[PDB]
């Protein structure tokens, strides 16, 4: 169920089980990596790039091509960006939550009696702390990195 | 040199008379393995070992920990967080009866 | 802790006043002429012990279990309670009457030494009966099969004379 509201929505994607890319897809791996780099340099987020690739170029997920360099693994958008040095420094979902929290902290300065919007702030910060604990454990963040709202 | 454990000695030498590798200290008895949890006093460390105890009535296990104070020679000089091997000796102070004889995995 | 204390060798009923149990026990007491209930209870306990040993060994396996199994069978058929070809299962079909038939009193009555159970009891207690050349004065002694046929009047007894008046009356029946 939902983490805080305990609702039970079920909507999501229903991906068919396939191994090989479809026959009608004509792009090679070089074309797809060029497209991903170009879209990233236009400034889109990682989740948005895949949406554009699916909608406009007819490419179901890039997780259908084997990594040309490492045969053990398949290809993903963040891996493609890592191969060129355009990958984000902070993981994206943590960054989005931090951005949402900062905007809400300036709303609460002019509206100190808005107590219902403040619980939302507390829940957002709980999510942030869970994420930073996970990323510290895996080494994606330095040992000293800390979330301080006054920063 | 070998002192009976069949493990590799430390790289450099020391001048501690209480060092089994380079001094007059003799080891005999138990040999335990553990993790350092304190190194504040001079030449003394605290080593923790964890084990399981069987509760017969409830047919389940519980976790217990044993903490031992050990003499730390300057040739080895263990720090907080690494795996060490300790051996039993004659009394050395009020609470010290073991000596560190090897660091197996530096922190 | 505590040192050893000697324990009773019989067990008492869980409820003292149960009508059916009282009827059954009265029938047995009158037929075999026992002095008190505890005597009867003694024999009952013996039976239960045998049964408890058979139930435990049917469910066991290993080397000691087989030794104890053959020891139980040998002891049971030495006392005359089982035929010489019986198996462990036949232990569970024994009854209380089988044990009461092995008392020295009952055997003296059945061999024709005495006319009655009570007379047999007295004959034993006063010392007129010998078993394998030795005088025994306990009416509850359990007789081994191997010695059953050497049971006679004691060679010093008044009754060891075919002309004694009381012996003749016993022969008369």
């Amino acid at each position: 169920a939902r983490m805080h509201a305990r609702k039970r929505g079920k909507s999501g994607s229903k991906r068919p089980p396939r191994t090989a890319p479809p026959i009608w897809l004509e792009y090679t791996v070089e074309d797809i990596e060029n497209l991903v780099v170009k879209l990233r340099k236009e400034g889109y987020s990682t989740a948005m790039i895949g949406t554009i690739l699916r909608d406009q170029y007819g490419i179901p997920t890039v997780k259908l091509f084997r990594d040309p360099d490492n045969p053990n693994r398949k290809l993903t958008i963040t891996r493609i960006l890592e191969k060129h040095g355009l990958a984000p420094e902070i993981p994206e979902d943590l960054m989005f939550l931090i951005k949402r929290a900062v905007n809400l902290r300036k709303h609460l300065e002019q509206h100190p009696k808005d107590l219902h919007s403040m619980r939302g702030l507390q829940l957002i910060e709980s999510k942030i702390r869970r994420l930073v604990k996970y990323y510290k454990r895996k080494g994606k963040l330095p040992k000293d990195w800390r979330y301080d709202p006054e920063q | 040199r070998d002192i009976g454990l069949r493990i590799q000695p430390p790289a450099e030498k020391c001048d501690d008379p209480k060092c089994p590798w380079h001094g007059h200290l003799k080891i005999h008895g138990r040999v335990f393995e553990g993790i350092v949890v304190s190194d504040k006093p001079r030449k003394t460390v605290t080593v923790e070992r964890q084990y399981y105890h069987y509760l017969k009535k409830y047919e389940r296990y519980e976790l217990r920990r044993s903490r031992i104070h050990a003499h730390n020679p300057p040739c080895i000089n263990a720090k907080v967080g690494d795996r060490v091997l300790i051996a039993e000796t004659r009394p050395l102070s009020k609470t010290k009866h073991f000596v560190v004889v090897a660091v197996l995995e530096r922190a | 802790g505590d040192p050893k204390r000697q324990r009773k060798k019989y067990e008492t009923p869980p409820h003292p006043w149960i009508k059916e149990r009282l009827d059954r026990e009265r029938v047995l007491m009158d037929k075999y002429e026992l002095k008190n209930k505890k005597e009867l209870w003694k024999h009952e306990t013996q039976l239960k012990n045998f049964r408890r040993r058979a139930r435990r060994l049917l469910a066991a396996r290993g080397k000691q279990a087989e030794i104890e199994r053959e020891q139980l069978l040998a002891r049971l058929k030495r006392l005359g309670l089982l035929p010489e070809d019986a198996v462990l299962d036949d232990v569970l079909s024994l009854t209380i009457e089988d044990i009461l038939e092995r008392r020295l009193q009952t055997i003296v009555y059945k061999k024709g030494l005495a006319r009655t159970m009570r007379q047999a009891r007295q004959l034993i207690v006063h010392g007129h009966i010998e078993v394998n050349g030795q005088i025994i004065r306990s009416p509850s002694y359990l007789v081994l099969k191997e010695e059953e046929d050497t049971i006679t009047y004691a060679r010093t007894s008044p009754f060891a004379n075919p002309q004694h008046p009381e012996r003749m009356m016993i022969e008369k029946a």
Partner: protein, 129 residues
């Protein structure tokens, strides 16, 4: 959350056989569930079963025959020595050779009769009768 795939499978089977279902789908598959199904099939408690691949963990399709009184998992997974099977039988089964306990040993998953024959112990994980 989901904590134990094997308990779900056995409770699902025992729920479905009480209303006369003829087949079931075990949704999270695993190798251990496959072993338990093989042992159950060898003794005639179920029919044929097969593995179906989605892009996820996979599914098992099982045929029922109406021959199960009850089936369940054992938690925690108690260790048992090679000569202590009788008391677990009395705890879980209805008569002296009625049904099986399923044991994980360092030679594989097997019924407690085979394990007792080989003379080894292991871990109790399920019972079926």
């Amino acid at each position: 959350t989901l904590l134990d795939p094997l308990a779900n499978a056995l409770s699902h089977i025992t729920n479905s056989e009480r209303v006369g279902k003829r087949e079931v789908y075990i949704k999270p598959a695993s190798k251990l569930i496959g072993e338990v199904l093989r042992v159950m099939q060898k003794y005639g408690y179920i029919g044929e079963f097969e593995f179906i691949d989605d892009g996820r963990a996979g599914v098992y399709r099982v045929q029922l025959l109406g021959k199960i009184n009850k089936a369940g998992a054992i938690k925690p997974r108690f260790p048992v020595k090679a000569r202590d099977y009788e008391r677990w039988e009395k705890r879980f089964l209805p008569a002296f050779e009625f049904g099986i306990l399923i044991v994980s040993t360092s030679q594989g998953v097997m019924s407690h009769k085979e394990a007792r024959e080989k003379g080894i112990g292991g871990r109790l994980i399920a019972y079926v009768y």
